[PDB]
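User: Can you fold this complex?
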Amino acid sequence: KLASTMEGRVEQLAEQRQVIEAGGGERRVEKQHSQGKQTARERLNNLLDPHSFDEVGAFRKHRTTLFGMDKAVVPADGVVTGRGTILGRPVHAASQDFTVMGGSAGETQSTKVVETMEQALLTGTPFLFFYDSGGARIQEGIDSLSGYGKMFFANVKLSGVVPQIAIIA
Amino acid sequence: LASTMEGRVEQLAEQRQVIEAGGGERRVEKQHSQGKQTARERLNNLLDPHSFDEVGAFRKHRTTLFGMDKAVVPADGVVTGRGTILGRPVHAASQDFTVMGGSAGETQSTKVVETMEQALLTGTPFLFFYDSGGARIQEGIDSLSGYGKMFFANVKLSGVVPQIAIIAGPCAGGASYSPALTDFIIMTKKAHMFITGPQVIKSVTGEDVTADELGGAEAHMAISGNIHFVAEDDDAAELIAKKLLSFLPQNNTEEASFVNPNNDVSPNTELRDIVPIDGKKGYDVRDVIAKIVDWGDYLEVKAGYATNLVTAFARVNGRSVGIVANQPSVMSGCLDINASDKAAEFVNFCDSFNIPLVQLVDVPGFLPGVQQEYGGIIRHGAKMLYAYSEATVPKITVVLRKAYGGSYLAMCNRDLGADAVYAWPSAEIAVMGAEGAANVIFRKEPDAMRAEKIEEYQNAFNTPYVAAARGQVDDVIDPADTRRKIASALEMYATKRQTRPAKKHGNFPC
Ligand SMILES: C[C@@H](C(=O)O)C(=O)SCCNC(=O)CCNC(=O)[C@H](O)C(C)(C)COP(=O)(O)OP(=O)(O)OC[C@H]1O[C@@H](n2cnc3c(N)ncnc32)[C@H](O)[C@@H]1OP(=O)(O)O
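Assistant: Here's the predicted assembly.
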């Protein structure tokens, strides 16, 4: 239910963006931290120049429905993507959120990653990706398997055109 | 020829003075009395002081029939050459009405085509002041051929170097097709343009119309859709031409030079209150444009034609951009035949000259009406879809409010290649209105069932969050951050390199 004024909706927007950014929640974030690991968003915030991150798909949602995916709430489908700068240089980046279903690669998540890579290719900028995952999302079966096929094809498409740096965290 | 060099130099000066006098003092006073500058005054006012370098002042016609053998026709009625505008090299032509009514002699057309070829060869803009009775009748098919060569040349230069036409007097007949083939036509209140004159119209159809009613600036702007700018007089046309040129590059291999950049991208909360949350209330989309572009500056193109859609040049951090925006305060912002043309032409031009396209969306669909269907809205609306799908410049779209079905796609969403799409919290992207939707999905089943199903369909698909859930918009944003969001996208996509399938050309709808 949307607020009656633009001001209300903007405040409403802010509250919703916060929920998404909280990812899997306090307990899981505490567990990530207790393991000596930063969160998906801390990694991007630490890597990119202060305030340069421009996120794409924060509100993106999976469309899968089997084995409980129809009721599951999966913030950003487990990956934070966008563009920013490093020492002023434009870059595109992705960061898997292990707090959201173990960072398992959902179909939509992989689509978000590929679109970000396609933008790096299109604009001729480097691409950096923080990996933190249990692999293809089992509940989505072949839907998530397809996501990886597209990702691998994209990695090769970018190979030798723009630098690609992977960080397994 | 004089006896000495010094003496021949003086002779040359006197001879050049005679040429530049054109049709003589009497005819020049008449031109001025009609509130028109002379061909040479126009070039002198347009170009930087003393930059004009003339070619062909002494060029003469070679025709001889029907009095031409004895006629004295200075520069054959046109002044051509090169100069600079704010330091930028340009080539230009300017018809001299005092000489045989500016009629287009064969040689005149050759001079014009040669100047056009030089503009192409060197990659500079080409500007032309028209003031003529059309093809010179005494030269029959010779003057006819000249026009054939001119039109072909306008097409050769199309999409390569910017072409600006300034109609500053009569433009009787087929000559009008040259301005049509250039990119922008600026018309003064002292100018007229038409394919068939009022007299011939009367003789053939019986219709009574004055030249003013038929093809004056207002008629072409508001009715015909033939021109891009209306100017009160020559001074105004000259100012408009320079302003227009300031947004464009020299040729298609470059992006326009930045001008007076305002690098601030701070938020402006004032943006939150321009678009009413109440769908039944309109507003001027230009108020939004003013708060997002540098210094609130913009040059609206075809401002008096199809006002249900705004097309304007402006700048963001000094970079030229073309803005296409629905105007909710006119015809509820519906797109129609004329606005589709107006938008498509603008999009194709910006794409040709590497000018990014920024869309401000608030469209409820295409205008309903038997005459819209009978007028071929199917093929005209397709022009928008074509232009945007073909365009490769950065395309940034911001949905302010309504975004319904095909009319939304026509405003360049992600599927038509927009590089970044943002939705305000008031964004209403939908395949169609919830009411119309229910009347089909739930045809079967009190009166509250209908109102209930409407709310159901509405919440399920038409909120900014569903659009974002599906990835149709990159983010939902605070209207206050609109400028920064556009500026950042323009910045990241400044290095965009996108290629199309190999082809001579696609088949653009007619
Ligand atoms: C290809 C093609 C086509 O359309 O398809 C052609 O172009 S056939 C094109 C046909 N184009 C035309 O028939 C239109 C021409 N005539 C006019 O409608 C008008 O002249 C007008 C609206 C341009 C101007 O009206 P105005 O009263 O200001 O003036 P004036 O009558 O004094 O004229 C200017 C002087 O230029 C001469 N003059 C004007 N137009 C032409 C022309 N096309 N060829 C040869 N001479 C011309 C006039 O005879 C006159 O001569 P002087 O001082 O000796 O009296």
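Residues B 100-101, 103, 133-138, 144, 147, 170, 172-175, 197 surround methylmalonyl-coenzyme A (CB under 6 Å). The CA atoms of residues 216 and 403 of chain B lie 37 Å apart.
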